[PDB]
Amino acid sequence: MSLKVDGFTSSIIFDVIRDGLNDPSQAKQKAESIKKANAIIVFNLKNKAGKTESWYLDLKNDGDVGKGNKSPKGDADIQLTLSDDHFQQLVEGKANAQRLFMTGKLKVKGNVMKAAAIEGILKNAQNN
Amino acid sequence: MSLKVDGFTSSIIFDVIRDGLNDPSQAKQKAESIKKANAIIVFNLKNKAGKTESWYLDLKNDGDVGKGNKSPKGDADIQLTLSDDHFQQLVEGKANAQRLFMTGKLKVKGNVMKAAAI
């Protein structure tokens, strides 16, 4: 879709990530991020209105970003649940995923060692 | 036991790993990392102040993380020595383990036999 959603200020970030990942001129890093991450990662964002919106970052099959809590090409390997404000802090680099986890701000389903690597995964994903 | 130690910026990952491994809602994630990894791994971290701290990751018995260079159920199978900065890079996804290895930044002592699966 156009991945931005009302009520989730950080959600424009998924539009940027999709564009950078899908850029035909980045075929190499896409293939490199798929071989390193080797996971479907779902983000369940929670806003200060009480709502839940989800997005998926398929870095195990062909390299897709989209709306929803399930990739159409598989089921999630990792689920990250956190507030819209904390996700935006994490992308801006003013919050650390491992500290967010330890203080109860980020919940993780699946392999925690790939969640720990999320902001590394997020850089090399769309880094044009 | 908060396993992180002052002076080792990366060591929070041992708290992260313990919580994620011991999470009761992840009984099956736990059960597979014990079933495939099938080793006790010790991390010997070195900081730029010259100190050494170690942690163990028992992933072949029931799956515990703790402080020190010796696991209480059976003892260490493979030992990894690296700096605090490089380990933090490795954990955060900004460095590759086998390239830390081929450049001498990461040292591997012990059994290749357990080491291959991690």
Do residues B86 and B100 lie in contact, with contact meaning Cβ atoms separated by under 8 Å? Answer: yes
Do residues A27 and A35 lie in contact, with contact meaning Cβ atoms separated by under 8 Å? Answer: no
* Smallest Cα distance from A110 to chain B, Å: 6
What DSSP character marks residue B24?
Answer: G
Do residues A78 and A101 lie in contact, with contact meaning Cβ atoms separated by under 8 Å? Answer: no
Do residues B8 and B47 lie in contact, with contact meaning Cβ atoms separated by under 8 Å? Answer: yes
* Smallest Cα distance from A104 to chain B, Å: 11
A43 alpha-carbon distance from chain centroid: 5
CA-wise closest residue to B68 among B48, B50, B42: B42
Do residues B36 and B117 lie in contact, with contact meaning Cβ atoms separated by under 8 Å? Answer: yes
- This PDB structure is determined at a resolution in Å of 2.0
Measured distance CA(B99)–CA(A3) in Å, rounded: 36
Interchain pair B20, A124: CB under 8 A: no
What DSSP character marks residue A38?
Answer: -
- Amino acid found at A29: Q
Which pairs count as long-range contacts for A64-72, CB under 8 Å and 24+ apart, including other chains?
Answer: A64/A18, A64/A21, A64/A22, A65/A3, A65/A14, A65/A17, A65/A18, A65/A21, A65/A22, A66/A1, A66/A3, A66/A18, A67/A1, A67/A3, A67/A5, A69/A42, A69/A44, A70/A42, A71/A40, A71/A42
Interchain pair B20, A112: CB under 8 A: yes
Question: Count of A–B CB contacts within 8 Å?
Answer: 48
Q: What CA dihedral angle connects A76, A80, A85 and A90, to 10 degrees? A: -100
| Contacts (Cβ under 8 Å, ≥6 apart) of A5 | A11, A53, A67
Instruction: Please name the method used to determine this structure.
Output: X-ray
Phi/psi class of residue A34: alpha, beta or left (left: φ > 0; alpha: ψ in -120 to 50)?
A: alpha
| Domain of residue A98, CATH code | 3.30.1050.10
Interchain pair B29, A99: CB under 8 A: no
Instruction: Indicate the SS3 state at residue B62.
Output: coil
Two tokens at B11?
């060591």
Count of structural domains within chain A: 1
Give me the sheet containing B78-83, strands edge to edge: B65-67, B52-58, B40-46, B78-83, B107-110
Chain A contact residues (CB < 8 Å to B):
36, 98-99, 101-102, 108-113, 115-121, 123-124
| Contacts (Cβ under 8 Å, ≥6 apart) of B89 | B95
Measured distance CA(B60)–CA(B118) in Å, rounded: 10
Q: Which residue range forms the structural domain that includes residue B29?
A: 1-118
Residues facing residue A39 across a β-bridge: A59
Measured distance CA(A60)–CA(B14) in Å, rounded: 26
Interface test with A, best of B33, B92, B94, B100 (most A CBs within 10 A): B92
Two tokens at B2?
């908060």
Two tokens at B47?
């900081």
Interchain pair A112, B15: CB under 8 A: no
